[PDB]
C-alpha cells in the first residue's frame, strides 16, 4: 500500500504515499492494465467541495481553523441554496495551479506554481469571450518570451448554458481535403475546418491558415471571430546546416494553447479554460511534422537530403527526424520564441519528480506520455518507473462540441 | 465482457475477447496503474485444475476438445499427481507449452515467429556437465554460421524447490564487467557482480572489454560450476560504420546470438527453472540500450566527438544525431557479416501484422506498450501508435530471483 518507485540507471528509490489520496478510477483492473489506452447534484457535490477545501485550508496552514470551518459551513449552506457554488478568487487559483500540478501527462509540471490565472467568471457573451482570449493570446505571447496563462469562463450550470471554445487550441492551421484525395493544411483539423466553414468562414485554402476562433458562451450557437494576426507569432523553420531546408515552407506557430479540456476544482466543472505554456521541440518536429496522419514531412526532407530510401535498415528516417527537430529548435531559438528541447524537459521532470516526492510524497506520471516520442532511452525518464493515478482538481477531456449541441 | 482498441494512425479498430481466459494478476487497481513498473513448493491442491486448464488448450488447439485421448490424458495426469505430487508432461505438450509461453510473452515484439521454434528436451540431463554439453549444442544449432535459428532448451522442472536446475548466467553469451579501484567499469557494467561471482568461482579473468563470461550451471540444486563456452561457437560481429571509417577504431563489436538464459517457464503449473532460450537482436538492443545507456558502454561522448558535434548545449541534439549512427552501424555490420539482425521499423511493422493476425484468430494479443515501443524513434514506428492491452496468460515466461540471492551452499 506504500509504493516504490525506482529509476533504473541512478538506483534511486521514492516512497509514494499520495496515491491513498486518489479519487478517480484509472480503467485498469488487477486482470487488465490499460495505460496505453488514449480515453479509458447536491449530494454528490458538497463532499466534492469539502475535499477540496480540506486541501486548500492544508495548504495555507490553516486546517482546521474557524475560517476553515466557517468557509465548510459558508459553502454548505450556499450549495443547499442555490444547488452549486462559487470559489474564493483564491480557491480558482489554487485550484487551476494544482489542476496542471496533477496532470499526469504533463512533462512540463516543474513550472507548475507559476501560472498566471485570469478570471472570466464576468464573461455573457461571445464576443466578450474574444476579448478575453485576445488578452491571454497576447499576454502568455510577450513577444515570444512565454508565459504560462490560463483564462477560466463561468462554470457550468444545468449544462444548457456551457461555456466552450470549439478549437482545440487557439492556434491552430487549417485543414482541408483536395479532390485528388489527398489533404492539404494540418490533417487533424479536417472535420473543424468544414465546421468553420459551414458557418461563414472563408477560407484562404492555403496549407498553413490559422484557423478562427469558433466561442460559444452561456450555451448559444458559436460564433466566428480572427484572432489579430499581429497576436500570433510565428516561426518559419530553417537549417543551421542545410540551406534547402527554408524552402520547404515549413513555419510552426509559438503559442501551444489548449482550449477543449474541461477543467473540474472542488467539484465545479470549467467547460471553457482555454490554457497556454510553451512547446518542447518533438511536439513540432516529431508528431506534428512526421506523424503519418499529420504533415507527414519525411519522405521530402529524405529526399532533400538524398538518403537510400530503399531499405528500412538504412534507418534513413530517424535520420531525417533528428534533422527536423534540429531545425524546429535552431529557428525558435533563433527568432528569440520561448522552446524547450526533450532532454532539457525530461531532464528537469525528474527534478521535479525528485521535489514532489519530497515536498508531497508523490507525483502521479503516465510513462507512456512523459517519455518523448524520439530517442526515448536517451532522456531519463525512460529508465524512471511511475505510478499513475488520479487526483483532483483536475484537467480532464470533454466531447466535442458539435456532437452535443442543440442547435 | 468485450474490448476494444484503436490505431490512431489508421482508425483501425480491433476488439479483444481473449483477455478473458485471463486468471494472473497485472499489479494495476483501478485506483493505480503500475504499467511502468520493471518488476511485478506448490501443492497438488493448486496443481491439478493448472493441469487441467492446460490440457484443456492443449487438446482444443489439436481440435480433441472432448475425446477419449483427452480425457484418458486428464486421468493419466491426475492420478500420476495425488500419487506422486507432481506430473510430467508428454514431449507434444512440452513442444506446446514452449511456444505458447513465447506467444502469450506481452513484451516481445518479436512474436511473428512464435510457432517456429526449435524446442531440445533437457530432462533427462542430471549433471553441470550435462548442462554445458546441451547449451553448447544450442548455442551451435542456433547461432547455424550465422543464419539464426529461435530454439530453447528445457531443463527438468522444479520438484521440491531444493534441487532447482538453473544457469546462473542472465545470457548464455554475455561480457564480463570489471569495478576498478579508481571507481570507473571496465567492460559491461551491468555485469560487474555476476563477472566477481565467476572470479571468486574460480574464473582467471582476461580483464578486457569484451571477454565472454564463463558459464555458471547449477544442477539439481547442487552448487554451481564453470565452463567455458567453446570460443569457435561464440559468433562475434565487429562494429563499423558505411561511410565514418573510424568507427572501427572505436574498438566495438558484439556477440551474435541473444540467448535469455535467467527467466523460469511456466506450463501446466510446472515449473522449468532452466530454459535458456534464443532468437536474434532487434537494431536498438545493441545500437541504443548495450551501447548508449549512460550504466553501459555508454559511447554517446567518444562517438559525439569524432563526428565533430556541437557538444556544448543540448539542443543541437548531438545526443540524437549520434544515436542514430550507432544504430546504422550496427545494422550495416550485421548485414554485412550476415548474421540476422532485424531493424526497429521491420521488427515493429510485423508485430502490427501479427497483432492483427491474432486478433482475429485468437481473439486478442496481449500487448505491453511500454516494451513494445522501440527505445528510439518510437513514434514513426506503428507501434506507439497503436492501443494495447496488458495482461497475463499462461503457459508463460516469469522472472525469478537471482540463484545467488536464494542459493543455499553445500561447500
Ligand atoms: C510551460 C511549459 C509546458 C510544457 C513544456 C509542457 C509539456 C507538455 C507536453 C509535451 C505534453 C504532451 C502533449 C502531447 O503530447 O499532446 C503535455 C501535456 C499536458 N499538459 Fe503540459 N506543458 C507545459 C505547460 C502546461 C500548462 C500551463 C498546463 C495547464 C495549466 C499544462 C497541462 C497539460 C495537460 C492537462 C496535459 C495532458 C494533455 C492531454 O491529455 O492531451 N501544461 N504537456
Ligand atoms: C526471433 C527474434 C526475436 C526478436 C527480434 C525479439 C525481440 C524482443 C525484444 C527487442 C525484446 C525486449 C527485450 C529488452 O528490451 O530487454 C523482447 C522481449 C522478450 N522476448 Fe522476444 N524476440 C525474439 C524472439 C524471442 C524468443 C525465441 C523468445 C522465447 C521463446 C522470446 C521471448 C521474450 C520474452 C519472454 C521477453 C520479455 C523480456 C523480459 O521480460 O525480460 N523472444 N523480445
Ligand atoms: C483525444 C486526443 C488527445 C490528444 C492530446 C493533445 N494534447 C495536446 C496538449 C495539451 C497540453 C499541452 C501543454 C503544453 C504543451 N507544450 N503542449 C500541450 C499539448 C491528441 C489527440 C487526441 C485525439 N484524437
Ligand atoms: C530486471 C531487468 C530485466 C530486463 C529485461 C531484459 N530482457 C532481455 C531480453 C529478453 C528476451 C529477448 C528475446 C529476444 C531478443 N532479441 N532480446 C531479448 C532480450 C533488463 C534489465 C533488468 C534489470 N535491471
Ligand atoms: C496508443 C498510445 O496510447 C498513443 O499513441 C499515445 C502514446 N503516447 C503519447 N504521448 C504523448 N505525449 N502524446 C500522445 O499523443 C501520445 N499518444
Ligand atoms: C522504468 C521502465 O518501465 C523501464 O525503463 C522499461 C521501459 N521500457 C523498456 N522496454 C524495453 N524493451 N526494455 C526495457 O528494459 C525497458 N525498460
Ligand atoms: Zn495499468
Redesign the interface.
Given at each position: 500500500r506504500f509504493?516504490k518507485?525506482?529509476n533504473?540507471?541512478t538506483d534511486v528509490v521514492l516512497t509514494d504515499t499520495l496515491?491513498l489520496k486518489?479519487t478517480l478510477?484509472?480503467?485498469?483492473?488487477?486482470?487488465?492494465?490499460?495505460?496505453?489506452?488514449?480515453l479509458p447534484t447536491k449530494d454528490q457535490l458538497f463532499p466534492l467541495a469539502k475535499e477540496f477545501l480540506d486541501q486548500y485550508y492544508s495548504s495555507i496552514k490553516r486546517f482546521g481553523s474557524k475560517a476553515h470551518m466557517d468557509r465548510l459551513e459558508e459553502v454548505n449552506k450556499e450549495i443547499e441554496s442555490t444547488s452549486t457554488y462559487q470559489l474564493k478568487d483564491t480557491e480558482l487559483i489554487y485550484g487551476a495551479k494544482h489542476a496542471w500540478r496533477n496532470a499526469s501527462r504533463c512533462v512540463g509540471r516543474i513550472q507548475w506554481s507559476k501560472l498566471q490565472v485570469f478570471d472570466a467568471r464576468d464573461c455573457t457573451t461571445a464576443h466578450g469571450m474574444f476579448n478575453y482570449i485576445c488578452n491571454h493570446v497576447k499576454y502568455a505571447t510577450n513577444k515570444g518570451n512565454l508565459r504560462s496563462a490560463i483564462t477560466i469562463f463561468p462554470q457550468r450550470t444545468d449544462g444548457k448554458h456551457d461555456f466552450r471554445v470549439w478549437n482545440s487550441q487557439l492556434i491552430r492551421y487549417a485543414g482541408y481535403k483536395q479532390p485528388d484525395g489527398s489533404t492539404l493544411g494540418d490533417p487533424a483539423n479536417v472535420q473543424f475546418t468544414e465546421i468553420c466553414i459551414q458557418q461563414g468562414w472563408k477560407a484562404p485554402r492555403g496549407r498553413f491558415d490559422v484557423l478562427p476562433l469558433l466561442l460559444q458562451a452561456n450555451g448559444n450557437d458559436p460564433e466566428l471571430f480572427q484572432i489579430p494576426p499581429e497576436l500570433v507569432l510565428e516561426v518559419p523553420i530553417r537549417h543551421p546546416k542545410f540551406d534547402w531546408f527554408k524552402d520547404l515552407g515549413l513555419k510552426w506557430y509559438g503559442l501551444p494553447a489548449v482550449s477543449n479540456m474541461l477543467l473540474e476544482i472542488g467539484g465545479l466543472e470549467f467547460s471553457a479554460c482555454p490554457f497556454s505554456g510553451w512547446y518542447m521541440?518533438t511536439e513540432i518536429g516529431?508528431?506534428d511534422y512526421?506523424?503519418?496522419?499529420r504533415y507527414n514531412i519525411?519522405e521530402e526532407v529524405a529526399k532533400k537530403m538524398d538518403l537510400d530510401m530503399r531499405k528500412?535498415?538504412?534507418?534513413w528516417?530517424?535520420?531525417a527526424?533528428?534533422e527536423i527537430?534540429?531545425a524546429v529548435?535552431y529557428s525558435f531559438?533563433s527568432d528569440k520564441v520561448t522552446i524547450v528541447?526533450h532532454?532539457?524537459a525530461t531532464e528537469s521532470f525528474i527534478k521535479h519528480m525528485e521535489n514532489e516526492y519530497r515536498c508531497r510524497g508523490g507525483c502521479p506520471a503516465?510513462?507512456?506520455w512523459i517519455?518523448?516520442?524520439?530517442?526515448?532511452?536517451?532522456t531519463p525518464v525512460?529508465?524512471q518507473?511511475?505510478?499513475?493515478?488520479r487526483l483532483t482538481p483536475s484537467f480532464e477531456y470533454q466531447p466535442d462540441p458539435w456532437n452535443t449541441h442543440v442547435w
Open positions: 509504493l518507485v525506482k533504473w540507471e496515491h486518489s478510477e484509472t480503467g485498469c483492473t488487477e486482470h487488465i492494465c490499460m495505460g496505453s489506452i488514449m521541440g516529431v508528431r512526421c506523424d503519418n496522419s519525411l528500412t535498415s538504412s534507418l528516417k530517424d535520420q527526424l533528428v527537430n534540429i529548435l531559438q528541447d532532454h532539457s503516465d510513462w507512456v517519455v518523448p516520442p524520439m530517442s526515448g532511452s536517451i525512460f529508465h518507473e511511475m505510478l499513475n493515478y
